[PDB]
From a paper:
The Bac-to-Bac® baculovirus expression system was used to produce VLPs of GPV comprised of VP3 exclusively. From these micrographs, capsid images were used to reconstruct a 3D GPV capsid structure with a final resolution of 2.43 Å. The GPV capsid structure shows surface morphologies generally conserved among parvoviruses, including five-fold channels, three-fold protrusions, two-fold depressions, and two/three-fold walls. The beginning of structural ordering at the N-terminus was observed at alanine 214, which is similar to most AAV VP structures determined to date. Following alanine 214, the VP3 amino acid side chain densities were well ordered to leucine 732 at the C-terminus. The overall GPV VP structure conserves the core β-strand A, the eight-stranded anti-parallel β-barrel (βB-βI), and the α-helix A, as well as the general positioning of the surface loops. Significant differences were observed in several variable regions, including VR-III, VR-IV, VR-V, and VR-VII. GPV has the largest VR-III loop, which is a result of AAV5, AAV2, and QAAV possessing one, two, or three amino acid deletions in the corresponding region, respectively. In short, GPV may not interact with SIA nor HSPG for transduction initiation, and it is unlikely that the GPV capsid binds to AAVR. Monomer alignments of GPV, QAAV, AAV2, and AAV5 show that the DE and HI loops (which form the five-fold region) of GPV have very similar conformations, which explains its mAb 2–7 recognition.
Numbering used by the authors:
A (entry chain I), B (entry chain A), C (entry chain J): 214 to 732
Write the structure that this text describes.
C-alpha cells in the first residue's frame, strides 16, 4: 500500500454547512499501549460481599476508539451555528480512518528508556459491525476523544462485564460469555498501511432543538369560554353542582392533553438563595432506586423533568441532572461542590414535563358517601396514560451523542435517559491492538506458555467524518428570540480556548434549546 | 372577479352517502365586527397573584372560523344514519368557502345608528397552513358555528396565550412570542370577491362506533376448563397449594389481557337513587390535579373510564364527564344542577376500561414470611403495562371533532381526552378581519399614531364541505341490535328542531356506540 | 509519492529576464523546531499596567515562512539590473515549494544529545488562502529568509494578537477570537513527500523606480510670462493692486498643482555638519503620536516626505525614516548611533512631497479690516486637498515587498507607509508544524491530559519563485543618467558578499530611484 517514507493520510478538521446538512470532520493523534501485556484477564469484584458492587468480566489486550461526545465533532462556534439557527439535528452517516501508523519499541536499560521505531511491527484493527461483542459505548464513560483537535488521547482499554452470581463473592456462571477478540478477522497494519470504514445511521427522530413558547395548560384562546360544564361541588342539600369553564378559569378547564409521566425526585438547593437544605443526608439512603435481581442501584437520571419552579430557581432535582466537572481531569477520589461541577438545567421542558421534585398531581384516595368525606393525596410517581406528551432530555456539546437500545422484546419510548439518540444499530465499535512481538526464544525447545515480549506501543492519526441532517427554523414570530452568545466578559484566557498553560477550557454546558416554537 | 350586483356563491347544505363515504355540506351566514378597533392588545391576568389563573397573551383585531363540532356538519337525522349503520368514521378531506361578502359602515349621530353599504371596503382572509400561529382550536371553546343552518353566528375574536412568569403577577419573558397576523400574506375581498381552500386529513384510526358485546374477563368458552393450575393457598403445614381453573372459576382464571390504565375518580351521585353524596365539598379541594411548573389545575376529563356500576347507576365519575348545557346560552355566572346539564355516559367502554371511581384493583403490599402475614391494598392509579387494552372516549353530535396533537418528542396514545381525532396536522385556522378604513386625516400633517377609523363590519356566507370515510357494519348476530330512535313522545315542539320562539333545541347528547361487536 | 532514498526536489536559484518580466527563483534550507511543545498558550502583557504596551493573544505550536523582503528574491547584481534599466516593477505570480523533508528526533541522556532520523514522522503544512487567520506578515518583523542563499534560517513561531481590554492588566473580551490551526485541513509529509502551491497577485500600480527631474513649481516655460494677474498688495489708499506674473516671478505664479499632504516631523541631525541638535530629549515625549482607543503610539513612519533641504543635508525627519542595522544580528537591548544603522534617504520625492520637518506652508489666520491687520502662521499638518500630487515611499533591497490592506469600509491611497505594495489579497501565509510524536503511554489507562512527547525537529528545502512585471525605461534625455554602481573601493572583503568568517555583509541600503523622468 505504502512505504516507510510516505504519509498514508492528511489532516482534516472542518465543518461544512450545505443546505439541510452539516458535515463535521476532525482528526486526532492517538496513542495505544499494549494492555494486559497481551493476555486476557478474568476480572471480578474480588472478595467484595456487597451484591450491589459485584461484577465479573474480562479485560482484553485490545483498545478502542470512543468519539461518542458532541464536542468531539463540533467546535463551540459550530455548535453555536447549530443551536441558534436550527430546530433539529440527527446523525446520518459516519466515516472513520486510521492512518500514519507508527509502531515503536521501548527498551529499558539501567532505568533508561530508549524509544525506537520498529518498522516491521504491526497493529491490528477491526470494527464489530454485527454488534457481536459486548457494547461498552453509550455508558457515558471516559476515554472519549478530547474536544480540542491538537490534544493527543490515549486509547482506553477494552473490557466488558458478563453474567455473574453472588455466592460468597462474584462468580461466573454458565450464561457467562467469554469473547476472544482474536477470534475476529482484523487487518494488520505496518507504518505504510491505513484503515477506513463507513457507517450509516438508521432513521431516528430529530432531536428537538427548540423550547416551547407555550404551556400545555395555556393552549386555549383566552378570549372565549369553553362550552364545557364541569362538576364543581356538592351543595349542602347533597345535590351535585356544575360550573361552566369560563375565560380565566384555567384551573377548572377541560383539556385534551396531559403532562408526561415522571418519577418523583428529591430537591436539593445547589445554588445561593431559596429554601435551604436539610443537613447530613446522602442520596444513597433517601434517593430513588432500582431493584434488579438481588441488587439495588440509584435511578439516575431517569426520564427528564423540569429543573425548578420560579422563585425556587436555585433548587435541583437530585438525581435528574447530568453533572460534568469543569475540570475534566479533576480526580474522583473526593466530592466536589457546585462550583466545581457543571449541572444541566432542563427548564426548557417545563411546559410539558413538570418539575422533578413536584408530585405529578393529586389523586382521590377514597370512595365517598353520606358518612364518608372525600379524601385525596399526592400522586408522586405515574406511568404512561393516554393523552400524555413530553420532551426528551436535551443534548449538550459535552454530552453523549448516541446510546445502543437494548435488544429486548419490548420498549417504551426508547430515548436514552442520559440524552442523545437511541439506536438499534449504533456505530460499530472500533478495536485496535498492538500485535505482540515475541522476545528471544530459548535455543532448546521447552513446553511452556510464552510470556516474553518486546515492549511496543503505537501512535497515529484518526479522522472521524460525520454527516448530520438538519431541520431549518421556520417561524413567523415577530419579536427577537433567545440566542446563545458570548457573555463571558473579561477573562485571563479566551473561553472555549486554551489557557496560559495550554489546557483547554470549556466551563459552560451548552444545550440546544434556544429557538422557540408553539406547542 | 365579480361585481356589486352578482352573487359570488350559492347556498349548499346536504349530506351525500356514497359507498363507504359520506360528504357533508353546510352553509352559514357569518358576522364579523372590528375587534380591538384595529390594534393588538397585550393581555394578562392583571394584578391577580394566584399562580393558577395567571396568563399572558395578545388579543388581535382578527376573527376566525371554528367548525370543530360535529353538529356543525351533521343533521340529527344524518347522525342517526351514521351511528345506526356503521362501525367507524374518520375525516378525510375538507373544503371551505367564503363568499357573498358585504362590508358595511355604521354611523352614529345623536344616538341614531345608520348602517350603509361601503362598496369599496375590503375584508382580509388567510389560512395558516403551516401551523405557524398559536393554535386555539381543539380546546372545546365557544365561537363554533351553531348547529342549525339558518342561525347566524358572530365570529369570535382571535387571541392566544404565550409564555408567562409569576413575579408579582403575570409577566412576559424572553420566550414569550408575539405574532402579527398582518405579517402573513392574506387576500383582500370586496363584495365581488370570494375565497376558498382545500385540506386533506392525515390517516387516523377510525373512531369506534360500536360497543363491545363481551367483557374482557369472559372471553373464554364457558364449557371447558383451563389446563392452567394457579397458586391457590398455603396450607396449615406451610406448603403451597395449586388449584385448577375450572369452568365457572372466572375469578381464578389466567388471562392474556388486562383492562386499560386509569386514574381514580371521585364518584358523585348526579341522579335520583343509589348511594347519596357527602355534603358541602368541592372538587377543587378533593379532586385529581395536575402539577405543571408552580401551578395546579384539575385533571379533567383524563382518559375515559366506565361511568357507573349497575345498581349504582345514578353515580358519575366526578371529573371524567363532559357536561354540556341543555341551553347553549345559559350564563356561566352561576352553577347548574343535573337537570340543566347534559352529561356524557361512557358505559359502552365498561367491558375494557373499568369504572372511574373504582380502583384499578388490589396490590400485594409486602413480602411475607413465617412471621409476616401477607397484606394487600387498593391499586388506585396505574399506568400502562404490557397486555392492557382500552377504548377511547366516544364522540358526540355536540362534541369536538379533532384536537391538535402537541408537538413533542414523545406521546402515549395520542387520542384526545375530550374525544375526537388527534391530529399532527389539524385543519388550518381561518383568520378574517375587516380591513381598517381610516377616517378624515388632518389637513396639516402631524406626527402621531393614527387612531381614527370609520366603523366597519362585514357579513357573508361560508360553506364547509367535509368528506368522511366509513366502515360498514358487518355482523353475523342473529338477534336485533340497539338503535338510536326517537322516544321523546309528546312535546310542545319537535325535538332537534326550533321551538315556538325559534330557538333550536337539542337536549340530548348522542354518542356513536349502538351497534355491538365481539372483543 | 517518494521513498526514503530519493530526493523530492532540486535546488533552484536564478533570475530570468525576458521581455517586460523578470522571474526570480531562490532555494533555502529551513529548520523547524517544535514550538510551545505542542500546545497553544494564551499570552498577554501580564501585570503591566501601561495601556500602551498591553496585548492579548496566542502563541501556537506552528511555524511559518516569511519571504516578504526583496533581498530574499534578488541578488544585489539583479537588483542593480532592475533599478538601472527600468521605470517600474510590480509582483505578478508566486510559486512556493517544500521538499526534501527530514524529520529528526533528539534524545538526551546524561547531558548528551543524539540526533537521529525518524523516518515515519511527519510534518504538517497548509496555506491560509482565504485569509481566515490573523495575518502577521507585512509588519516588518524578523524571521524572514536570510538574503544569502546558503544561509539556513530557523522558521519563526506563529502567534497573533487579539482584542484586549485594559482593566487591571490586559484581558480577553467577548470579541477576542481564538484560532486553532489544527482546525484547518493540512497535508502531512514524511521524508518522501513534498508540498507546493501557486499564487497570483492582484493588479497593483507599478512602483515608481524613477526620480523626477523637475520640481512641481518649475513646470512652466521660463521664457514666457503668464497671462494671469494676481492680487499683490493694498496701497496706502486702501485699494487693491494686481501684479502680472512674469517670467522669473516663480514665487507669485498661479499653478494647477499642489504638493502632497504631510505630517510635520521633528528634524534630527544624524550626520556630521549642519545645525546641531538640542540635547537630552527623546521622541516619545516630543514626537508625533496616534491616539487609538485609550492608547498612544508614535506615528512612524507616516506617508513619505523629503529627507532634507540642501545645506541642511545632514538632518533627518525623526520619525519618517526606515532604520536598518548594518549588522542584522545586532542586539536590540541597547541603542545605536548612526554609524551602526542604515537610514533611508527619500530625497527623490523632494520635487512633489516637501521636506519632513518643514511645515506645509503658511496660512492666513484672520479676517482683516481697516482696524485689523492681516496675520498668518505656519501650516504644519495638512490633509488631502484637490490638486495635490505626491510620491510613495521607495522600496529597498532590504525592505518589505508587500503589506495587507486592512479590511475596512474606507481607505485613502492604500499605499503602505513602510513602502511596498498594498494588497487586498496578499500572498497566503504558509504554516508548518512538526507533527507531535507521543512518548510511551502508561500500561494502565489513566484519564489525564497527554504531556509526553518525543523531541522532534524538521529540516528541508524550500523554493520561492516569483514573477515580476517591468516597465521599460523610455527616455529622450540626451545626457547620461545616474546609475547605481560599486564605488566601495578597497575592502577586506567583497561588499555584498561573505566576509572572512562567512557572515554576509550588506551595509548599504539600495533604493530603486536612479533613472529620471519629467513630471
Amino acid at each position: 500500500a505504502d512505504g516507510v517514507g510516505n504519509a498514508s493520510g492528511n489532516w482534516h478538521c472542518d465543518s461544512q454547512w450545505m443546505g439541510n446538512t452539516v458535515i463535521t470532520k476532525t482528526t486526532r493523534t492517538w496513542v495505544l499501549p499494549s494492555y494486559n501485556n497481551h493476555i486476557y484477564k478474568a476480572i471480578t469484584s474480588g472478595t467484595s460481599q456487597d451484591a450491589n458492587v459485584q461484577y465479573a468480566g474480562y479485560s482484553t489486550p485490545w483498545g478502542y476508539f470512543d468519539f461518542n461526545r458532541f464536542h468531539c465533532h463540533f467546535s463551540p462556534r459550530d455548535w453555536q451555528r447549530l443551536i441558534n439557527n436550527h430546530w433539529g439535528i440527527r446523525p446520518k452517516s459516519l466515516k472513520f480512518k486510521i492512518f500514519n501508523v507508527q509502531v515503536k519499541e521501548v527498551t529499558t536499560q539501567d532505568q533508561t528508556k530508549t524509544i525506537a521505531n520498529n518498522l516491521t511491527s504491526t497493529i491490528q484493527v477491526f470494527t464489530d459491525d454485527e454488534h457481536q461483542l459486548p457494547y461498552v459505548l453509550g455508558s457515558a464513560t471516559e476515554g472519549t476523544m478530547p474536544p480540542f483537535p491538537s490534544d493527543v488521547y490515549a486509547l482506553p482499554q477494552y473490557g466488558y462485564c458478563t453474567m455473574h452470581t453472588n455466592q460468597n463473592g462474584a462468580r461466573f456462571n454458565d450464561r457467562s460469555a467469554f469473547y476472544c477478540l482474536e477470534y475476529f478477522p482484523s487487518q494488520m497494519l505496518r507504518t505504510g498501511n491505513n484503515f477506513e470504514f463507513t457507517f450509516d445511521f438508521e432513521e431516528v427522530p430529530f432531536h428537538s432543538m427548540f423550547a416551547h413558547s407555550q404551556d400545555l395548560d395555556r393552549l386555549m384562546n383566552p378570549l372565549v369560554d369553553q362550552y364545557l360544564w364541569n362538576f364543581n361541588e356538592v351543595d349542602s342539600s347533597r345535590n351535585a353542582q356544575f360550573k361552566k369553564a369560563v375565560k380565566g378559569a384555567y384551573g377548572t378547564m377541560g383539556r385534551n392533553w396531559l403532562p408526561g409521566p415522571k418519577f418523583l425526585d428529591q430537591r436539593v438547593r445547589a445554588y445561593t438563595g431559596g429554601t435551604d437544605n436539610y443537613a447530613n443526608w446522602n442520596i444513597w439512603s433517601n434517593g430513588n432506586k432500582v431493584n434488579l435481581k438481588d441488587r439495588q442501584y440509584l435511578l439516575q437520571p431517569g426520564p427528564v423533568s423540569a429543573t425548578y419552579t420560579e422563585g425556587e430557581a436555585s433548587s435541583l432535582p437530585a438525581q435528574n441532572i447530568l453533572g460534568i466537572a469543569k475540570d475534566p481531569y479533576r480526580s474522583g477520589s473526593t466530592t466536589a461542590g457546585i462550583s466545581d461541577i457543571m449541572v444541566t438545567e432542563e427548564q426548557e421542558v417545563a411546559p410539558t414535563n413538570g418539575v422533578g421534585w413536584k408530585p405529578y398531581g393529586r389523586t382521590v384516595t377514597n370512595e365517598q358517601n353520606t358518612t364518608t368525606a372525600p379524601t385525596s393525596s399526592d400522586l408522586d410517581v405515574l406511568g404512561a396514560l393516554p393523552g400524555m406528551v413530553w420532551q426528551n432530555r436535551d443534548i449538550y456539546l459535552q454530552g453523549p451523542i448516541w446510546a445502543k437500545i437494548p435488544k429486548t422484546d419490548g420498549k417504551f419510548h426508547p430515548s436514552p435517559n442520559l440524552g442523545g439518540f437511541g439506536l438499534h444499530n449504533p456505530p460499530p465499535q472500533v478495536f485496535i491492538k498492538n500485535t505482540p512481538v515475541p522476545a528471544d526464544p530459548p535455543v532448546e525447545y521447552v513446553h511452556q506458555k510464552w510470556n516474553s515480549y518486546i515492549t511496543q506501543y503505537s501512535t497515529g492519526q484518526c479522522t472521524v467524518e460525520m454527516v448530520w441532517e438538519l431541520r431549518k427554523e421556520n417561524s413567523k414570530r415577530w419579536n427577537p428570540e433567545i440566542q446563545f452568545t458570548s457573555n463571558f466578559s473579561n477573562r485571563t484566557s479566551i473561553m472555549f480556548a486554551p489557557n496560559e498553560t495550554g489546557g483547554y477550557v470549556e466551563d459552560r454546558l451548552i444545550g440546544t434549546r434556544y429557538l422557540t416554537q408553539n406547542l
